[PDB]
Design an enzyme around this catalytic site. Sequence first.
Site, PDB file in Angstrom:
ATOM      1  N   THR B 155     -20.487  -5.002 -31.439  1.00  0.00           N
ATOM      2  CA  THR B 155     -20.038  -6.069 -32.119  1.00  0.00           C
ATOM      3  C   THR B 155     -20.824  -7.039 -32.108  1.00  0.00           C
ATOM      4  O   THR B 155     -21.480  -7.731 -31.411  1.00  0.00           O
ATOM      5  CB  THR B 155     -18.499  -6.199 -31.665  1.00  0.00           C
ATOM      6  OG1 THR B 155     -17.987  -5.210 -31.240  1.00  0.00           O
ATOM      7  CG2 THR B 155     -17.657  -7.012 -32.933  1.00  0.00           C
ATOM      8  N   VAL B 184     -11.168   3.850 -35.641  1.00  0.00           N
ATOM      9  CA  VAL B 184     -11.382   2.378 -36.536  1.00  0.00           C
ATOM     10  C   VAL B 184     -10.960   1.252 -35.496  1.00  0.00           C
ATOM     11  O   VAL B 184      -9.625   1.144 -34.913  1.00  0.00           O
ATOM     12  CB  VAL B 184     -10.634   2.428 -37.753  1.00  0.00           C
ATOM     13  CG1 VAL B 184     -10.979   1.242 -38.520  1.00  0.00           C
ATOM     14  CG2 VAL B 184     -10.529   3.404 -38.470  1.00  0.00           C
ATOM     15  N   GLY B 185     -12.010   0.316 -35.049  1.00  0.00           N
ATOM     16  CA  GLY B 185     -11.552  -0.951 -34.332  1.00  0.00           C
ATOM     17  C   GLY B 185     -11.009  -1.683 -35.246  1.00  0.00           C
ATOM     18  O   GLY B 185     -10.423  -1.633 -36.137  1.00  0.00           O
ATOM     19  N   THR B 206     -14.651 -10.302 -31.007  1.00  0.00           N
ATOM     20  CA  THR B 206     -15.287  -9.286 -30.536  1.00  0.00           C
ATOM     21  C   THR B 206     -14.570  -8.917 -29.022  1.00  0.00           C
ATOM     22  O   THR B 206     -13.749  -9.580 -28.426  1.00  0.00           O
ATOM     23  CB  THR B 206     -16.627  -9.745 -29.877  1.00  0.00           C
ATOM     24  OG1 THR B 206     -17.450  -8.364 -29.375  1.00  0.00           O
ATOM     25  CG2 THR B 206     -16.861 -11.029 -28.844  1.00  0.00           C
ATOM     26  N   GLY B 207     -14.671  -7.621 -28.486  1.00  0.00           N
ATOM     27  CA  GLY B 207     -14.095  -7.186 -27.383  1.00  0.00           C
ATOM     28  C   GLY B 207     -13.194  -5.987 -27.699  1.00  0.00           C
ATOM     29  O   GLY B 207     -13.595  -5.156 -28.578  1.00  0.00           O
TER      30      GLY B 207
END
Lengths: 295, 295
Positions: B155, B184-185, B206-207
Amino acid sequence: HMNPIVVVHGGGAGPISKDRKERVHQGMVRAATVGYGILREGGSAVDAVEGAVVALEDDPEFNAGCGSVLNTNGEVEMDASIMDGKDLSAGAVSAVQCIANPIKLARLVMEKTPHCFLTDQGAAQFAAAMGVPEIPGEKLVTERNKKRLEKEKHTVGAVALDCKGNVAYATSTGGIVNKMVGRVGDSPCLGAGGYADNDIGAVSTTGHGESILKVNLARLTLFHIEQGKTVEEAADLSLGYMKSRVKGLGGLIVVSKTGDWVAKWTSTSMPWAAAKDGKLHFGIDPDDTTITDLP
Amino acid sequence: HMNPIVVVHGGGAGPISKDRKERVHQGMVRAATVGYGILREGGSAVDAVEGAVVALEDDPEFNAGCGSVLNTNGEVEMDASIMDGKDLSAGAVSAVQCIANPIKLARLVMEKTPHCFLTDQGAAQFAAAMGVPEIPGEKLVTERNKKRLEKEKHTVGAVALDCKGNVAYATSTGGIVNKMVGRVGDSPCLGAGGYADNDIGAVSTTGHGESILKVNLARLTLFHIEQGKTVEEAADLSLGYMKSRVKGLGGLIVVSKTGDWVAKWTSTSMPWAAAKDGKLHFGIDPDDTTITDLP
Ligand code: NA
Ligand code: NA
């Protein structure tokens, strides 16, 4: 314990022709019935929203499952999502094809994978791995949706609060007529198409998907509840903002953690049904609300 | 008129080697300097964030574009989104393959369609129609990511404020290693991977993607800022909530409409850079930051 409740919607629409309103009326009643029957027998909020939305997916009168609008190529691509208010666990799919019940696939994603969202080909492969049957694309396509597309060229949801005080939402759609291939709307995106949180409530939304996404309508509505607005005040402000900021129309159903509920919209119509305290509450147009006994 | 600021992150991570540390450092420098360079000409926040992220996508050291992690099938599938805070215009792509710069495609969704979100096959067809090169798949696969995929089988982002007062965010990712096909994030999901609103600020996150989605991290951060909390307070509250509620760690960057900015994380490390007033800030570990003049 909590008196349970289910609210269902059959999507935002413009003016509806006389005879359609009746079959739409028939559809809503059954959807709320399936959901309320689940809650009346100690079924979960997740079970209740899933059941209600399968009924609307199964009914060709509604833009989800069988009867989904067709993309720019005359094919059905579907989105769905479901959310468990207890721990915020969730599942969702986008642009799924050749399946009957998108919402059931979203619950599989929630309960059986370490993920929250699958799309398109990966969604197909998971379905087949879960033994979800493959139906021909033509089993989902109606004649009326063929007519709608040929003229353009030239959603459904449920919320529930169960006996333990858990909340949940589900949303499922065929999208928007004449959409580009692979267009994804709000309905499989948490916070936009829907959100569920035991500490606040559950919302399902409908309308212009691009706008709902932009303003994060479902989560937005709940924010206002956290401020101390009623469910109706919260709905007014969030839909009001979607109208004022991005010029978008639609509607939403919500239930609070304490049992308060409303269905509000800014489009012309929104078929909605609710079931609480052995009664059925139904409407399509503003203030046409009918109340009947639900044994 | 406002003093422009660009903030960039290179994704949360566990502890990083001292060698790679420096390779990551120069790339963060490359990205922030590109984005600032864009603002220097008086360019838009959307221009700047697209520039900063394109630079990170091309860079093999970061998990987006070239150097994206591999999914279960050893393949690269990418997610990216972009949002313009002035009018909430937005563009996103999910599960895109075999193109260099998913963030560039996300902008094309934003400015060259009435849609906000395309996925898989539909996005790839749109990529063909806009004359985006379908490059070889192996070129995005790096030897390092193969080793990481074998082991698991046994990311990036930017926010800007421009001199016209506009804000934007751009986020891009290869997701997580050995992810299911079509997972899908949060990255392409508005309100989760990022949010931008001229009336509040902009955020890029992010993460753990499922955690970010579940709590709608970027939008929650902005809710605290609207409520009067400082950028740092707000980031600490939303990250703090993500950790306790869904047991996910992450990171973000945020810039308010008044030019105030921060990078905060609950992961071990989050490489980041901010360019403002002729100084480039940079850190990876908490507390220790280097500030140097920018030519
Ligand atoms: Na249907
Ligand atoms: Na890269």
